[PDB]
Amino acid sequence: PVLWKILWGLVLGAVFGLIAGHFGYAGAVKTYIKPFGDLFVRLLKMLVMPIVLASLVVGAASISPARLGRVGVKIVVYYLATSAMAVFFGLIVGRLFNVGANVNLGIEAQPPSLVQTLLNIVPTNPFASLAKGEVLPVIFFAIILGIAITYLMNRNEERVRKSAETLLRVFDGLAEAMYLIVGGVMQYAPIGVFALIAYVMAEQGVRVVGPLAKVVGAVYTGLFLQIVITYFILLKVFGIDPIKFIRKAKDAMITAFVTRSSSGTLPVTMRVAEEEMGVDKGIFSFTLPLGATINMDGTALYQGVTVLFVANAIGHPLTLGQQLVVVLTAVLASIGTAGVPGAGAIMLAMVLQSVGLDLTPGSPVALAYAMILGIDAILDMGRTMVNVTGDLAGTVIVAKTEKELDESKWIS
Amino acid sequence: PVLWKILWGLVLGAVFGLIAGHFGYAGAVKTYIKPFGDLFVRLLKMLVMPIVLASLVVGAASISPARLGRVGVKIVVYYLATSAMAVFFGLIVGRLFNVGANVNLGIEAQPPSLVQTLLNIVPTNPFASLAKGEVLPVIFFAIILGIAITYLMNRNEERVRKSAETLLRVFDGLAEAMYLIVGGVMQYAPIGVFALIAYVMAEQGVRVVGPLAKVVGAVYTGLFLQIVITYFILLKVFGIDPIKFIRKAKDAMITAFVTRSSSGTLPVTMRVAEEEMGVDKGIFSFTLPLGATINMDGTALYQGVTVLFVANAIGHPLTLGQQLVVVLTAVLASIGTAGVPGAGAIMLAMVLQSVGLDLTPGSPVALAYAMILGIDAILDMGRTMVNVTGDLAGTVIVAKTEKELDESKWIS
Amino acid sequence: PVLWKILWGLVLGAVFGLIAGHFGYAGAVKTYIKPFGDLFVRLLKMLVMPIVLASLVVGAASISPARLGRVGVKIVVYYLATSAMAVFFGLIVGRLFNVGANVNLGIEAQPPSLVQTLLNIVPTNPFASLAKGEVLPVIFFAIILGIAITYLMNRNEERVRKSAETLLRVFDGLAEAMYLIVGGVMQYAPIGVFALIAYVMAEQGVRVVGPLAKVVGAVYTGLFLQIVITYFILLKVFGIDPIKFIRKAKDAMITAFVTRSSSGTLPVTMRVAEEEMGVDKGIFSFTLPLGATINMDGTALYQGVTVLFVANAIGHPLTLGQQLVVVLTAVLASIGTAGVPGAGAIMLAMVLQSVGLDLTPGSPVALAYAMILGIDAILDMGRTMVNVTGDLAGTVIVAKTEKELDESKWIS
Structure with a gap:
């Protein structure tokens, strides 16, 4: 029927590719x-800013400031827990696969700019942030508008109430229109998924052989563990069936795989959270756009494996603790960057530079880096898919602890 | 009275200039x-994006998706027919006038990028496209919003209906405000028209003498034929009085002449289509902004004549078929570019480059090009005016075939 | 209690700094x-564009075009009067203090671009002006929208009226939400004020000694006179108690001091004009954003003093009339520039260049300029505070002459 059509698009595309x-x-x-x-x-992509704005104004209107604060802190704690596990599995699987058994030949510290990253959460011109597609300041402005709107709708004066209600309905109508449009685009999704996976397989699939296959194998094993261990256990502990969860997440997961963008999948992830998961807009309009930019699981996995691969290819000895400190400094440097193709490849290059390595043409390290770079798309697909999965899991979890999850959706 | 004041502004300005x-x-x-x-x-210019957005959301709400599809295909077929005629008249009149009987001294192929032009129809961030004034992606987003809005207003749930109606009224109010403001600006139009035609006549009018006069004569003859033959016949065939049509188009036509921008005339063209022509918003809010960017009549005319002029000035033999292929490749390269001053001059320079000619200072071709460049404003005025005329004709025509034209407006 | 908390923040911050x-x-x-x-x-800053837009659409809706015209002309006449006084006090106090009794060693004319500055008042794309934060074209568009909206709400057709009312309520709701949010931010203001004045005092406070102290003293004396003479007398003449005025202005005045931006203080200045001063939105939504960009009092004061300081430091003889002509040419060059930190320092450098002076490293003039540059922040604080004070005074005054001031607010 229509359902699962996407999984056919993916499978058929990958074989053809x-x-x-x-x-x-x-x-x-x-x-x-x-x-x-x-x-x-x-x-x-067209849908990201309208749906994120309108859903969060409405959602933040529907909910008390207090509950919103708890949602903020609960979801951040979740991303810390899950990134810690992702670091672990990155280190483990990288070493189990022993990435980099090929043979080549074989100092930079910069201040922390997180203070300014936090300050940068506040937009100085919200129209500019909408036009430039900067998600986190839009989140901030939408939240404050939602709060303000509900304070005004409880005010005594009818003019203020009627104005506030009109404004909120304009945002509600826009959100509704976006969700409807998402549904329509998802009628098209199988063709798009086919085309994307086809192109990726034809260009970089043929290149996964020998050592790089063990890198890909290693990376994909880490993601797998992160799902079936970290996400499943967290879901069961809080009383969500992880198999039902996965079934419901499937369209968001496959879209994440092929588009390689957490933000670009958002309209789909939010429709899945509403229609399938049964999460209230008060939760997911906030948790999901936020998680798309702060989730560090795929990064931890990528860095753990590729850093080990590089170190072994050039015969540089790397202790588990040294690998850990390196991965951690890459993760801290990465926070705040949303999901974008070719991101982690750039970050790996930075990490290598910061530890004092020669990336000049012909160098061993330039060579190992180019090798990763050539499968980077294959790695990015998996990175984005595990991040969006973790985002849905954490949204569902938080929604449950707040009694904002509709249970009728979870029972066969 | 007020009516025809613009034609006095134009006439008086040109003499003074x-x-x-x-x-x-x-x-x-x-x-x-x-x-x-x-x-x-x-x-x-101030009015272009607000009026285009709001009118198309409302218009596309007022009309069924099906009818919108037919409007799309009907108006594109119209622009193909009329550009074919424009190519013909460009070739004919250029040769009849024998442009370029003066005497001077006397290889580049690039892939087609239309696939990406089409992809570029879809905005990745609609707030960005509004802020940058990109018409075609705004058209796309407005259409989808209008459609979505009407689907929601037929939905059962009253909250969705009331939200959708509020959103649609916000756009309707904005459109109304814009149309009112257009009316006010058109109280000022005679002064503006005077000033513009005055400046153009004083700077480049004095230069139309000798050979360049035959170029101007040639170009303006081609436009004339395109109007009194292509537009008039098409109008009569479908049962619109072309003289009544012209009378109604006059304010849009003169504004197009002086402003030299199809897009910049849009608020006027749309007010003329509504108040004078009696076209429903469901038609013109779509056909007119689209035609402002895809109409290729003025380009075909300009290229046909100026290409012949250049070839003859340097004594390069040019067969009618060779001229045709050249003009056609310029038209294909031009599609998607909206009406902008100094456009065709740039495109001519490109066409000359692509055929393998030396534009370096002192060269014969650099000389002939500079000669065209110096009357280019005089040519642009005519180019824009014939395009906007054809846009109104095609809008009216399409509206008639769809029974969306108010006939009381057409009878003395 | 909460009131005056800001003045404690300022005082406490400056001592700590x-x-x-x-x-x-x-x-x-x-x-x-x-x-x-x-x-x-x-x-x-986040609040500037939303609150300015929505307040001026609503305000300009609430009021007749005629009254708006009178408000425009009344407030411009006010800024001319007050800048003339600021020029006077700049010249006077600069000479009284005899700035520049230290000893060093010791031709450019450019056309007036005001025609284009005026043309630039009209935005060509209002979405672009909102996204870029350009206040004056947004003022223009908001005014025209407000006017159009009220014309439509008096129209006979109910659809137009209901659409216009919906649009106006959307803007009213947004304005209300912004004002509420301003109130919340002002709960935070004391901490911010403390932090800002602390940083400024720690960096540049220690440097006010010797000659530069007389410059600072001189500048601050000029501001003082401008307040207690120009603003107070104008207020008394029109029957506003200047001490009550000052008491009401205090939060806007202190915020102006620390933020060093007339535009960045606007949400506070407008809340003060509404809640404290009792000015109708029809007045202040227009006068205040306009005055933030055209007020030339602080500039006249700064240029008068620093120009004299520079001339005396290099032993260049400067007559009072020559100083006047120089200050006046700097003021004319400055009009239209909104309040921004490090502005006047740049303008002083320009003024020096335009009169034919050598700013190359090592030169006497480069030295005197660097000396001003090092206290420039201390001077900017005062410049911005006197401008915002004058803006509130003129808004209140104009509101009184129009019978738009609520008198119950003015009586103990």
């Missing part, structure tokens, strides 16, 4: 197939 | 007169 | 204290 690439034809795919996926991506 | 230029005083005109016209232009 | 700087610790202040003030500044 592999075959096309193996036979030389990845160029034709780039020309003919890929535009359909680019279209899918654009259609979803 | 010619006289001032002939007597040396074009500098004083630039200083003292021109700012009033720049003001006219800015006041109209 | 001076002590910290005198003992070496200004670096720790920059690190630990200053971010709280930067936060204060950002929170206020």
